[PDB]
Amino acid sequence: GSYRVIKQDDDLMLDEAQVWIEYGISEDNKFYIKNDKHKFEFTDEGIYI
Amino acid sequence: GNKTLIEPRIQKAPNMLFKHQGVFYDDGTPDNHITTLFISERGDIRASVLNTETQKRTTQEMSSDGSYRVIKQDDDLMLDEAQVWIEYGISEDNKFYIKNDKHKFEFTDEGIYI
């Protein structure tokens, strides 16, 4: 039950992607937006980057 | 052929669904993954994945009013009376939000609120 949207620019396979962006709901209850740089996460309590 | 329209017999809108399930597979473990693509008569769309034995569900719901909503549950299959859950999407009113058991993160048409 993990919502996930992934976009890739230079690799069709999901594995071994250099340039990409992701955002959704992981297998654990954590809303996040992540890329090659450090991510933006919204845990059940508080705001972290 | 004689230039008359082919009227449908039933004018009431239908409700579709693509229910998927099994029994077992080559790994030997019992199959308990249920997923649906239910569509209501009022235009709603609900894509859901379910594990019934473990009591876990993740739904992507669309309302007739046009409300984007994705819900994940950990201990209750029914949407009603959920303790542990997380939601994020577009409510019936124009407000982008991410909410859980703790206080939510909302993005109104103007400003940022928590």
Tell me how far apart the terminal alpha carbons of chain A are, to the nearest angstrom: 24
Provide the 3-class DSSP secondary structure of residue A43: coil
CA B45 to chain centre: 7
Q: Is B77 on the interface with A (CB under 8 A)?
A: no
CB contact under 8 A, B51 and A1: yes
Given an 8 Å threshold on Cβ–Cβ distance, is A29 in contact with B100? Answer: yes
Lookup result for tokens 């705001």: A47
Question: In whole angstroms, what separates CA B81 from the centre of its chain?
Answer: 16
Task: Tell me if chain B has a CB within 8 Å of the CB of A49.
Answer: no
Which structural technique was applied?
cryo-EM
The two tokens of residue A12 are 């069709």
**Data resolution in angstroms:** 7.3
Give the sheet arrangement for strand A40-42, strand by strand. A4-8, A20-25, A31-34, A40-42
C-alpha closest to that of A44 among B111, B98, B79: B98
Distances (CA, A) of A49 to A22, A42, A43: 15, 8, 10
Strand pairing class (B56-62; B45-51):
antiparallel
**SS3 call for B52:** coil
**Cβ(B99)–Cβ(B85) below 8 Å:** no
> What's the start-to-end Cα distance of chain B, in Å?
63
Question: DSSP string covering B88-108, please?
Answer: EEE-SSS-EEEE-SSPPEEE-
Q: Give the residue carrying structure tokens 């690799």.
A: A11
Q: Is A33 on the interface with B (CB under 8 A)?
A: no
Query: Cβ B86–A1 below 8 Å, yes or no?
Result: no
Interface test with A, best of B49, B86, B102 (most A CBs within 10 A): B86
